[PDB]
């Protein structure tokens, strides 16, 4: 679990979105595993606007942060699930690091701010849904 709070927006993994997120829907993309909902309270997360390939992510299954090198956002394979059939997920970045079920939503940050959130895992790889291209989050 986990979310990004910027302005009047809440960014969450689409597969973990609540009834409240869907009733206050702003935008969602199944191919990215992202959903953004509106909030009453003001958020203060800073979104990174960069091409960093290094950062630190929070891993809830170890209660630890890990430094990682990660790939550029691209179209990449997942496996099926209560939530998706096998498919390419777009805007996904991989890193060698630890993840397993429940680690989705952990934030990945670089020196510029929030880069994305954990969205996939397995085989000693962790995948992050990028949010750096969503320029509208700031306005
Ligand atoms: N996190 C994690 C994890 N770590 C290890 N094994 C499996 C997983 C689970 C996983 O990858 N997914 C299940 C939920 C939906 C995800 C998606 N974006 O399509 C895929
Ligand atoms: Zn950066």
Curated annotation (Swiss-Prot):
The chain holds residues 869 to 1007 of 2193 of the full protein. Homodimer. It comes from the Viruses. It catalyses: Selective cleavage of Tyr-|-Gly bond in the picornavirus polyprotein. It comes from Coxsackievirus A16 (strain G-10). Cysteine protease that cleaves viral polyprotein and specific host proteins. It is responsible for the autocatalytic cleavage between the P1 and P2 regions, which is the first cleavage occurring in the polyprotein. Also cleaves the host translation initiation factor EIF4G1, in order to shut down the capped cellular mRNA translation. Inhibits the host nucleus-cytoplasm protein and RNA trafficking by cleaving host members of the nuclear pores. Counteracts stress granule formation probably by antagonizing its assembly or promoting its dissassembly. Zn(2+) 1 binds at residues 50, 52, 110, 112. The active site is at 15 (for protease 2a activity), 33 (for protease 2a activity), 104 (for protease 2a activity). This is Protease 2A.
